[model samples]
Target: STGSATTTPIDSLDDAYITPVQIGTPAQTLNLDFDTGSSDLWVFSSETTASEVDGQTIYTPSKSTTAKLLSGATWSISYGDGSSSSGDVYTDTVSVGGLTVTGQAVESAKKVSSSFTEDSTIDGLLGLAFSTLNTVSPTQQKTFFDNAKASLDSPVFTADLGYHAPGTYNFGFIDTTAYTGSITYTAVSTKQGFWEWTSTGYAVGSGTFKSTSIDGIADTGTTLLYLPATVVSAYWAQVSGAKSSSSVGGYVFPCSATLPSFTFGVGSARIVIPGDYIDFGPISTGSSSCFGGIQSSAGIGINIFGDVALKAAFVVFNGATTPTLGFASK
Candidate 1:
């Protein structure tokens, strides 16, 4: 497959992350950091009743004429980053673009902190990252994509991101410009609920992306990708002048030049990531250094790819169309 929807230098992950969509007549939208890492929809609402939440978008129950409440269900979540928030459950006519799904269950977070309230551009999050972390269960359990697939004209989702900052990230349709039309798409593995994956060996050169014979997962909720340090050091060895600037995080490489093209062998699927991503935003450092797409977490967790990776292919969560745990890549 020459022109597969592929992007360079993506970190494979298993955790799920999604963008938040606001449903309305015209379909208001926003980019959310969705995570199957935890289940819950946390959006900046216009209804928080606190002036202290100056910069957040408050979801006005009165404004959304089609909103509903869960009567007595309560919700709360704690993140590994030490941040937490809680709220009551409610429902509304959630809208995504021109599509509208009625009676969608949502959580209205009231006890948001100042840090959470400060960012207002982000309207809300759609917790379709996974079923295990779902806020809706037993009754009207549904994912944003699940509802959209039932009504969206096209039963597909895609991401359109470039090397790093200011790239167009979209869903529902694939972006052809991302790769050569003759690109090869790696088939999704039906391993577990997570985006479990096996990769081809990465390169071990200088000033470029290296190939590794590592097995890992790609995740969207997680911002960083992790690998064994021995493997990581082998990777940075190729970055022209790359070094271990920060042992606490992933490898940091100089952004002075385009990084090398690191390739991954996932079964028969061969993927190459551009050097830019490995040296920039996704691997952020002050100016021109990067935290290599790979890092070191506890050894127990598998290699995970985050948003940096999912943006390339047409990812289908097994239960995304069904209700069980199996994933397939189109």
Candidate 2:
């Protein structure tokens, strides 16, 4: 058997996708961000400080007869963007689509940073990263995917993300109809708890494809495409009036600037990101400036192939002993 869920795009921002998930005995439904960049399933909870909680939906474990607190266990996590959350633990029934796993560890937030509290739509985070990255103390926790793997027909999941459109996240099977053409598969190095892979090379529109290898992570949680300084500069150089903006953060260019298509290699597969996607949208509503979705990964130290890049292709996340990433056009 398999499970599937539809992901809705965040209005205006078009930065992330939110999917519905059920937790607890009575099935308390919450909107969660399916983040592949980190491993932690945490939600705002009754235990969260009232002052710390804003407009977020809170999960009250006491309402669930099956909820059991794992005494002495705790979890805390911080993201590259400086957003953070921490809390105690509870094990309960967690379900996505029709798939359910019992006694799954769920981190209930006691405190959260401004980044989370301000985002009212995000009730929690459903981490799709490897279980090895789970943050529970005393004993690490398993992700929903890991706990449900044994019962799956095949240990695989696919992320079919669309630009400003609804997408599907399928578990235990690959729906061939969701994509077009043949899927290209590449070996993944999960040493960092991320779907990490190296690109054979990259190039600007119509330019010579460079053979320089670039290591990067496939992160659905992030919105922009981050690469080396040199690579980012090369692409922006082709666009007129594109300048780094400390006020808006990252490079911004005139909305009218003509952008060139960018291409990256994965083994023998060459995925090209259209110029329109590269120009993420205006820096602010009604503004003539737009943010460059492609930026330098200087302080981050590693390149990130975020939604701007991933949305260009249909992706398969193979969870076999030798994990592999498969890509195809939609």
Candidate 3:
């Protein structure tokens, strides 16, 4: 058996790619962010506080015939920005695109941070990372991909993220049409439950590749590309007037300046993120200065090759006993 799903940006800006998920009997549909960096399938639900609930679709377990409360189970997840979501758990039939998982642990939110509350486009997150990262207590729950991997045809899943258009997520098999050349595979260290791997090196525009290896996670949930401070500085140095701004929260430069493309290695292969992609939208609604998509991971600890970077490649996440990540140019 195999699973295939479509992902698209909820709005005009490609901040996060969302997939439609069906939960419980009769198919209660909710748009969810399919995250590879974290493992916890949590959602806004009837159990959530009214103050916390915006216009998002809520999953009411009581309405589902196949829903069963997992007594004594609870889960809480918090991000670096202090945004958080916490609640109880339930087991229900969950489906993403063409595949279904029986008795999937569905975390129902009881409270939410203002950031999640204001982001009305996303209903919740469907994590595809290692099950070890599941936040459920008493006994941690397995992620949807982990629970379904055994039944999948090849024990693998692929994420093809788009810049602003619709993307796709295919499970158990790789699609040849998604990438241009052969895939360059690399071993992933799942020490922190992330699809973490080290790059061979990185280059700014047409510059020579720096031998400095950078370790970062492939996170579909994150919106920007974060690298080591030195790498970020090296990139901005090539630009005429780019500067890191505390007030704007990232590096910004003149909109008229020619921004160079950034390239990072995947073993021997290299993937170049388009210059236009790095010239992330303006800081304000209509401004002359533009914000940079690539930022410094300094002090944040973990570097992130988030959506900004992933949009340029076809990444395969192999869930074999010896897990690995495969990257190919799109």
Candidate 4:
């Protein structure tokens, strides 16, 4: 039924829960942030200090007899938060989310901070979102999805990054059962990295993108929706006590009042970002403004609609078959 677009409200998860898949195992557990933005299933390596690896599970290559060292092929990854980790590269039997494969090249970190080492629950990052977009090479590896592409009912894979609530992050096949009806599918632009996308317009509080122009990409790997400054200011204008919290630097306002809701469009597909999502807490600065999900583009090379926005609906990425994206009608 192709009519007008439909919008649905979704609750995000507070903490990311990880489900681990052991080497040679056919089954996989719930995992967090399996990104293609960077390669390496970066985890709390066995060599890490006990304190740093408190709530996390370290991947011990020694445990897997089948694991093989990359022999001088080492690697490392740095984050936007200025945190970094490094280790010798290894190839091992890795598994996750009921999926398994052999000779999967991986990273073995010798050092880690509380961000990864301290959290016992932070099992590890799966990091299989893209094949060609990897940091490791010379036998530049393919992620689990790359191995599973042959049999997936749909070449596309979908991810829901439940940002705040105890949400369900689903994989494998898109659960048609989770949808109301047919999906409002859209063709993705093959212009840049996985970060490329287009939206109908930006709306602030009960507003819709009225203009015909749309820009930006939906990135599951990112945590915030980076929008243009004009749109951000226009949105805050609708809020009463809302002002930019210089201390935190994002949109912040009095918690007593409910923030406005906005809807963005992608072709025929539409997504409604709830007020709660718009209402971010204070940052390091002294201002009491909420963290603005929508920020100035700063003329950044690419605008991104990170996890917070993409999780609202099921976005299927078809890298194997036709290389398209389908937005499930919420």
Local accuracy of candidate 1 as per-residue lDDT tens digits, 90-139:
77666543445676666677666654556454444555454455554334
Ranked candidates (TM-score, high to low): 3, 2, 4, 1
The digit string of per-residue lDDT tens for model 3 on 97-168 reads: 779999999999999999999989899999988999899999999999889988998999999999889999
Which has the greatest lDDT? Answer: 3
Please provide, for model 2 over 7-68, each residue's C-alpha lDDT reduced to its tens digit, 9 standing for 90 to 100. 88876657788899999979899899998898899999999989888787889999999999
Regarding TM-score, does 2 or 4 come out ahead? 2
Tell me the spans in candidate 2 whose CA falls farther than 4 Å from its real position: none
lDDT of 3: 0.92
Instruction: For each candidate in the order shown, give its overall lDDT on alpha carbons.
Output: 0.51, 0.90, 0.92, 0.58
lDDT of 4 at 275: 70
Off by over 4 Å in 3: none
Top candidate when judged by TM-score against the true structure: 3
What lDDT score is found at residue 117 in candidate 3?
Answer: 95
After superposition on all C-alphas, the RMSD of every candidate to the true structure, in Å, is: 6.3, 1.3, 1.0, 5.5
Instruction: Give the CA lDDT, 0 to 100, for residue 111 in model 2.
Output: 93
Please provide the root mean square deviation of candidate 1 (C-alpha atoms, Å).
6.3
Return the number of clashes found in candidate 4.
29
lDDT of 2: 0.90
Could you tell me how far off, in angstroms, the CA of residue 198 lies in candidate 4 after the best superposition?
1.1
